[PDB]
Amino acid sequence: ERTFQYQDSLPSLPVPALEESLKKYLESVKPFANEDEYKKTEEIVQKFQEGAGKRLHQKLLERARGKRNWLEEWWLNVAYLDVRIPSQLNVNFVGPCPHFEHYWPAREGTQLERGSMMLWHNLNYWQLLRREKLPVHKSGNTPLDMNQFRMLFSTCKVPGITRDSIMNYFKTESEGHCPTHIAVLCRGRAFVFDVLHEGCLITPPELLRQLTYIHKKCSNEPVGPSIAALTSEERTRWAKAREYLISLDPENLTLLEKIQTSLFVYSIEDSSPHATPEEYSQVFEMLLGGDPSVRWGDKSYNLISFANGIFGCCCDHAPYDAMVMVNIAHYVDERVLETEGRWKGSEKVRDIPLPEELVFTVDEKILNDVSQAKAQHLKAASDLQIAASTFTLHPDTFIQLALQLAYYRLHGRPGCCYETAMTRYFYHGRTETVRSCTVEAVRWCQSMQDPSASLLERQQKMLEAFAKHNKMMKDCSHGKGFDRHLLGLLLIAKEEGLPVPELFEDPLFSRSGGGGNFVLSTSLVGYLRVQGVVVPMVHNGYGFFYHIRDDRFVVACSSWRSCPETDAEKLVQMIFHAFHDMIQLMNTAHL
Ligand SMILES: C[N+](C)(C)C[C@H](O)CC(=O)O
């Protein structure tokens, strides 16, 4: 069995029934509306269904007739490539490598040693992919889309004046040649070397020399030009700085392409985030912040190495979703466990070429842009607050409802929530929106805060909330959600220069969460001991992510300090109390 052999058999992403979608939409706005607003919205929705919507839906169906996935391109453009704000900090997702829970605790001086092995395992995974030996993901006996795995290596974003683009150079052995070099960023400089020698992958010892030549080459000297820092800028500025940097030297384009085509970017930091099984929130902060001088935000996969031998990943969210990064990070974690975090093979170091530096041609302007880029990224990042902890009836649904109660208790109002739902059952299926803030969830929350409420009432309502969410999560993953659907109708109109339907201008549309207005941006990152996070979706919002182990729940919450009403720390505390309260309500209501 080969990794991508089921791609041609995957079913097309479906288009829900118009009426079904609108009904789910109408139901979702209820928690945020009174009689009048609701009736107003209901009227708007009915006219839509009968008129414009029916026609835009018909056009959406025609689009699906010619595309195995009608959403693919639109989603990439409207959710990522078209956005102009700084993506590195505001869209990229990060995740700490959990190797410090066992064999690789935080410890100065282990940076180059562990790093050599980090590269070795990562590269073995790449080889696994290139040979299509990576196991096909399956739900029962149903194969899942594996296309996002093509975006892990040799993939990089390229800025545009109005729209960025994605460059995917990866290729399987069957498809042809694939870049075989990695790019290392250090002290504002960029080096690259071939990971192959005489046909086979270079061993850790050899990988150690390569990182040694680079580390020294710029360790006793001040930082370099830091062209990389420009990747953390507003998308248009970066696009302008790039065109310029190139106009100075036609060769600069060649260096940029070297970085873009590399299997991935390895960043060597000098900072040391406090990383321990108890406190690791700091790892998230330096992962999303850090020193822009050695980060290539446009890279789909940027492995980060700190001084205390701690590791983390920062990825461009545009080409793929977090599950691919979670998979390799976990694969490596397992490799570390089996080898007790050590290389026990040959110590020989064959005579392989030394890392070649990429010396960009710059002037006074570029250096100013570089200086500005660092300042804006660092300034913006300092406003970020991260709270990470471990807590020791589907687990995901349990956490989602607990978050609803927690937010409800902390802010005294229902929090419109976005929960990611994977739709990989379909060709190139990525995600769908699950709206956790349902009528059921709210009624349950109220009862939880209702002194006169009985235990039987509370559990009965909590259960109805679970049933509603489970169903919702199931339907959404099966392509029966409505968020992407409504987006498609809107995009059908826009693409033809037709006016924006009144449906989207409705105050309730955005109050319920539409238009990227969810106060709670969330997602389960899996069951593979790896955790990640991103910044909130709105200034007065929260970012809440988590992963589930058979013995604990691990969460990571983000919030903006500049916003006085939110506090990531207190929310995490609140959800833990919510977990507890929900526990008692289940054990007590045992009879
Ligand atoms: C950050 N968040 C949850 C809003 C988006 C997800 O990470 C990806 C998605 O749902 O497409």
Side-chain angles (χ1 to χ4, degrees):
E1 174 178 290
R2 279 167 50 172
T3 301
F4 310 97
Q5 65 170 52
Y6 292 121
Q7 297 293 120
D8 296 322
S9 77
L10 292 182
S12 297
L13 178 69
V15 180
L18 211 210
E19 196 179 74
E20 289 307 294
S21 285
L22 302 177
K23 290 157 61 184
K24 299 191 174 184
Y25 167 56
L26 269 171
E27 180 69 35
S28 79
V29 308
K30 292 183 178 170
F32 316 97
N34 56 42
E35 283 186 58
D36 288 302
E37 304 165 311
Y38 185 72
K39 282 295 299 180
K40 170 184 175 182
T41 297
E42 179 173 44
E43 176 60 285
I44 289 173
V45 176
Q46 295 185 304
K47 291 187 58 179
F48 190 67
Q49 184 182 191
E50 305 175 307
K54 181 178 178 179
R55 179 75 190 123
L56 294 169
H57 177 71
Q58 166 58 47
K59 297 221 268 294
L60 216 211
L61 294 177
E62 305 182 310
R63 181 185 181 74
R65 187 186 64 192
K67 298 179 180 293
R68 296 186 64 199
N69 188 314
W70 62 265
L71 180 66
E72 240 195 319
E73 172 163 51
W74 278 342
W75 186 244
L76 181 62
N77 285 166
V78 183
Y80 305 110
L81 306 188
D82 293 337
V83 186
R84 304 292 81 194
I85 64 179
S87 53
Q88 188 171 315
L89 164 63
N90 304 293
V91 190
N92 281 211
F93 55 80
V94 308
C97 296
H99 309 145
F100 60 86
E101 289 185 67
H102 45 271
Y103 298 110
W104 289 355
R107 182 169 57 187
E108 284 300 315
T110 69
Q111 178 176 180
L112 281 49
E113 322 313 308
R114 298 177 180 180
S116 69
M117 289 176 284
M118 278 301 290
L119 294 176
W120 164 256
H121 291 135
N122 268 276
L123 290 173
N124 272 301
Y125 196 82
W126 161 69
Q127 203 167 56
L128 214 52
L129 259 181
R130 190 169 157 63
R131 299 173 186 177
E132 297 189 67
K133 301 299 176 183
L134 188 64
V136 173
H137 287 193
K138 297 182 179 185
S139 180
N141 283 293
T142 307
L144 299 182
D145 184 81
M146 297 298 285
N147 186 251
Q148 296 178 50
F149 278 95
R150 288 177 167 291
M151 313 304 155
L152 177 56
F153 302 110
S154 300
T155 301
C156 187
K157 184 193 301 180
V158 168
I161 299 300
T162 61
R163 173 179 294 172
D164 298 1
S165 57
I166 293 298
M167 300 292 272
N168 175 48
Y169 308 102
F170 173 80
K171 283 191 181 60
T172 62
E173 304 185 312
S174 301
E175 306 176 309
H177 174 67
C178 170
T180 61
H181 68 282
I182 67 166
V184 184
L185 305 189
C186 190
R187 308 275 286 182
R189 314 166 64 176
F191 295 76
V192 302
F193 56 93
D194 197 300
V195 303
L196 296 182
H197 183 62
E198 291 183 54
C200 74
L201 213 59
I202 54 179
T203 69
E206 303 176 306
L207 285 163
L208 182 52
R209 189 204 83 178
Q210 302 297 266
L211 295 184
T212 292
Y213 168 87
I214 299 174
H215 190 58
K216 295 300 181 178
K217 202 89 298 301
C218 48
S219 52
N220 49 60
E221 298 139 58
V223 187
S226 305
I227 288 297
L230 293 175
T231 57
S232 72
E233 266 276 42
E234 189 276 343
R235 307 313 298 169
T236 295
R237 282 194 55 67
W238 172 207
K240 287 171 178 172
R242 184 169 181 284
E243 303 177 305
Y244 182 95
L245 175 66
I246 301 175
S247 65
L248 281 175
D249 193 328
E251 164 251 41
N252 284 312
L253 172 66
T254 301
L255 278 54
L256 290 172
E257 298 183 307
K258 272 192 173 67
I259 303 175
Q260 283 157 43
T261 58
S262 68
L263 295 174
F264 62 83
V265 179
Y266 188 66
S267 299
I268 294 182
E269 299 267 311
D270 289 304
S271 48
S272 299
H274 185 65
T276 75
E278 291 63 58
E279 205 62 58
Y280 50 84
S281 61
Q282 197 175 311
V283 188
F284 282 109
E285 297 180 53
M286 268 176 248
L287 231 38
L288 277 173
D291 196 313
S293 66
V294 291
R295 299 299 184 75
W296 199 268
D298 292 344
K299 202 67 179 163
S300 69
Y301 182 48
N302 188 173
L303 222 197
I304 312 304
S305 176
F306 292 105
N308 49 30
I310 294 297
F311 296 91
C313 304
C314 182
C315 313
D316 169 31
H317 209 328
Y320 60 1
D321 303 309
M323 286 320 279
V324 176
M325 188 256 262
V326 163
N327 266 268
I328 179 170
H330 179 76
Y331 164 81
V332 169
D333 196 54
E334 300 185 304
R335 295 293 71 67
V336 175
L337 278 164
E338 303 188 315
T339 63
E340 290 177 359
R342 299 167 49 177
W343 164 248
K344 303 184 179 183
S346 178
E347 293 181 296
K348 309 301 181 181
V349 178
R350 291 168 291 168
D351 197 65
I352 60 178
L354 288 165
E356 305 180 68
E357 169 154 41
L358 300 177
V359 201
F360 287 93
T361 301
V362 303
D363 57 47
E364 191 185 309
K365 188 192 188 311
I366 289 298
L367 288 178
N368 287 305
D369 296 330
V370 175
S371 180
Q372 196 178 303
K374 291 183 183 177
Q376 63 82 43
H377 176 284
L378 282 169
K379 186 176 183 180
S382 66
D383 186 45
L384 187 63
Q385 174 166 55
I386 302 292
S389 303
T390 307
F391 186 79
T392 55
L393 304 186
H394 194 94
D396 184 68
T397 303
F398 182 84
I399 293 180
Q400 280 295 319
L401 292 172
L403 182 60
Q404 282 296 296
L405 187 59
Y407 182 99
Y408 184 90
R409 282 172 172 176
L410 185 63
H411 298 285
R413 73 187 81 88
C416 54
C417 178
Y418 177 120
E419 199 208 337
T420 299
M422 66 88 106
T423 57
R424 288 167 58 206
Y425 290 111
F426 310 103
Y427 176 86
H428 292 192
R430 285 188 68 166
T431 65
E432 174 67 78
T433 303
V434 168
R435 303 189 165 196
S436 310
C437 195
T438 60
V439 173
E440 293 80 352
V442 181
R443 294 184 76 238
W444 166 61
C445 280
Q446 305 187 314
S447 69
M448 286 296 282
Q449 303 304 299
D450 176 6
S452 72
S454 64
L455 301 175
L456 179 64
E457 190 200 322
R458 291 175 177 170
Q459 190 188 66
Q460 185 55 49
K461 292 186 179 182
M462 187 193 278
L463 293 183
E464 300 188 315
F466 270 85
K468 175 65 177 185
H469 197 284
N470 292 328
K471 165 68 171 181
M472 195 157 52
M473 171 56 83
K474 189 196 69 178
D475 291 25
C476 286
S477 66
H478 282 60
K480 304 175 185 181
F482 73 85
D483 274 77
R484 299 296 183 273
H485 186 176
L486 299 186
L487 176 58
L489 302 178
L490 172 67
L491 299 184
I492 284 287
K494 285 186 160 302
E495 205 164 65
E496 305 204 326
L498 299 163
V500 175
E502 192 177 312
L503 178 83
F504 306 93
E505 309 185 311
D506 185 341
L508 278 184
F509 184 90
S510 65
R511 185 187 301 172
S512 63
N517 288 297
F518 293 94
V519 61
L520 287 170
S521 184
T522 77
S523 182
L524 161 58
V525 297
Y527 315 81
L528 297 180
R529 301 198 297 278
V530 177
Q531 184 56 56
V533 79
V534 291
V535 305
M537 186 181 304
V538 297
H539 178 62
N540 59 302
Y542 291 99
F544 192 97
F545 303 86
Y546 48 92
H547 74 88
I548 299 165
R549 299 183 192 186
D550 62 6
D551 68 303
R552 77 194 71 164
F553 291 150
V554 176
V555 309
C557 181
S558 65
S559 61
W560 294 111
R561 281 156 184 162
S562 50
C563 181
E565 286 70 61
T566 69
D567 187 306
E569 198 62 58
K570 192 56 159 54
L571 182 59
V572 173
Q573 299 179 181
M574 292 302 274
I575 193 169
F576 281 24
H577 280 159
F579 288 154
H580 180 61
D581 291 20
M582 290 168 78
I583 298 299
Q584 181 187 300
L585 180 55
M586 302 181 296
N587 299 319
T588 299
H590 206 69
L591 291 69

